[PDB]
Design a protein around this ligand. Structure first.
Ligand SMILES: *[C@@H]1O[C@H](CO)[C@@H](O)[C@H](O)[C@H]1NC(C)=O
Ligand SMILES: *[C@@H]1O[C@H](CO)[C@@H](O)[C@H](O)[C@H]1NC(C)=O
Ligand SMILES: [Mg+2]
Ligand SMILES: [Mg+2]
Lengths: 269, 269
């Protein structure tokens, strides 16, 4: 229940997000080709994909990721990495909200996520703004898995509307803000947010709705199981803020489902 | 390629080997249903498979695994687990041989593998013969991945001939003995050994041939890639002792290939 072209984009940026974990380089020199261990990003390798900027443990919050240039699919991809130990990150995850009137009025965002992007915003903003210059005809995409998907969502909403669209592909991303921030991410122009979830993944269910958090619409839900390859007919678009019938169900969640988004993600062989 | 039935058996015992890693209850009571985390053994869960005897950190070489009763497929499965950390086990691997003339004269086996099996052979032989006694129409299968594949190979060659056939399914198993032991394993009576390898897996290339180690015949080589699903057309039968063309090729080996035998194995999500 998705166009074949959309399914390919979902698959391609899932591998870009996985490359933020399994890239052979975290302190790469700019210009080297992007490769993954254990065949984690086969389609990223097939393209003329090179680094533009890499960062490890930058700002505060340990923001890790890279900015890439794809000459085959005609993209500038900013990819954030999730936590190095997702099992640890889930348990020690804070729930405090912080007023983010700098993005939208009445909006409240997860304090950890918002403050992490700001500490790196001023640096990352020029790196994307220098890349969009030398390649204005290229599509700028923000992507990330787990915490990376949350960072890409905050970064996308903060840099949108300055001359270029920014599309965001998040995989297993947690809730990032309150109802007002969820409404903002749902209708904000200048790019499309693609929020991907997998079965009963626990992370898209955190922080709880009992703490004022809310999800943006729509949701692209993967019904196929863990370690099962994903097809076009295994994805359901679910419209509605905080809608049920997808990842937001009152059943018992699962951690392994967090690591299977079109393939192995969040870890490397 | 292999037949549809043999392909189904290759898949089933790969999950029995993977269950030795990702069994939820390692110190499981006898009679509890066999389940896995991360969907690591869905075919075992679908079957009426229960634990007969579970052993963890047993014997000398930290022998871990379980004996299982499968009433759906009429099987008595002895599954051996590999090393907890495959990377550290590959490095700290001795190449010392020890005479095992009581299995076959002129035969020498890897001193580590043979001594570990002997440290629990008496205990495990009784548990197996007890299960064969109450289910004489059941097939006895020894299986294992990595170090577990080596233990299943030497335990089969030892216990064979005592009234019940013993088939062995090994996945990514290293060499265990000299050429005299390889020819014995190749033509031994009372059961069939299925030695299964994947692309350029490093473990079936250890210990090196230059230290007096040989591989039994034949070889079932999975030529499909890592994180790629296996079809029956992706398995190649290769006859000949120490034959080349499958896993034994003059190229650079790979560790991730060791963790993909029909699915994720050797680690758990
Ligand atoms: C980098 O990628 C390009 C495009 O595929 C390729 O032609 C080039 O050889 C790659 N560089 C290396 C060192 O592999
Ligand atoms: C255990 O498995 C058997 C056979 O598959 C089934 O009849 C039984 O209901 C199961 N019980 C539990 C608790 O899983
Ligand atoms: Mg959201
Ligand atoms: Mg052998």
């Amino acid at each position: 229940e998705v166009s074949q072209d959309l399914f390919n984009q979902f698959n391609l940026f899932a591998q870009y997000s996985a490359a933020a974990y399994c890239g052979k380089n975290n302190d790469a020199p700019a210009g080297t080709n992007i490769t993954c261990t254990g065949n984690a990003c086969p389609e990223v390798e097939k393209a003329d994909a090179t680094f533009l900027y890499s960062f490890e443990d930058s700002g505060v919050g340990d923001v890790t990721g890279f900015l890439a240039l794809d000459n085959t699919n005609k993209l500038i991809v900013l990819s954030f990495r999730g936590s190095r130990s997702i099992e640890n990150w889930i348990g020690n995850l804070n729930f405090d909200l912080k007023e983010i009137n700098d993005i939208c009025s009445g909006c409240r965002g997860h304090d950890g996520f918002t403050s992490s992007w700001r500490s790196v915003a001023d640096t990352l903003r020029q790196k994307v703004e220098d890349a969009v210059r030398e390649h204005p005809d290229y599509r700028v995409v923000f992507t990330g898995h787990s915490l990376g998907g949350a960072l890409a969502t905050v970064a996308g909403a903060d840099l949108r509307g300055n001359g270029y669209d920014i599309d965001v592909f998040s995989y297993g991303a947690p809730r990032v803000g309150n109802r007002a921030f969820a409404e903002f991410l749902t209708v904000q122009t200048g790019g499309t947010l693609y929020r991907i979830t997998h079965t009963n993944d626990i992370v898209p269910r955190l922080p709880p709705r009992e703490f004022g958090y809310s999800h943006s619409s729509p949701e692209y839900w993967i019904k196929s199981g863990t370690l099962v390859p994903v097809t076009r007919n295994d994805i359901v678009k679910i419209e509605g803020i905080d809608a049920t019938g997808g990842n937001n169900q009152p059943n018992i969640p699962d951690i392994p489902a967090h690591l299977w988004y079109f393939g192995l993600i969040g870890t490397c062989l």
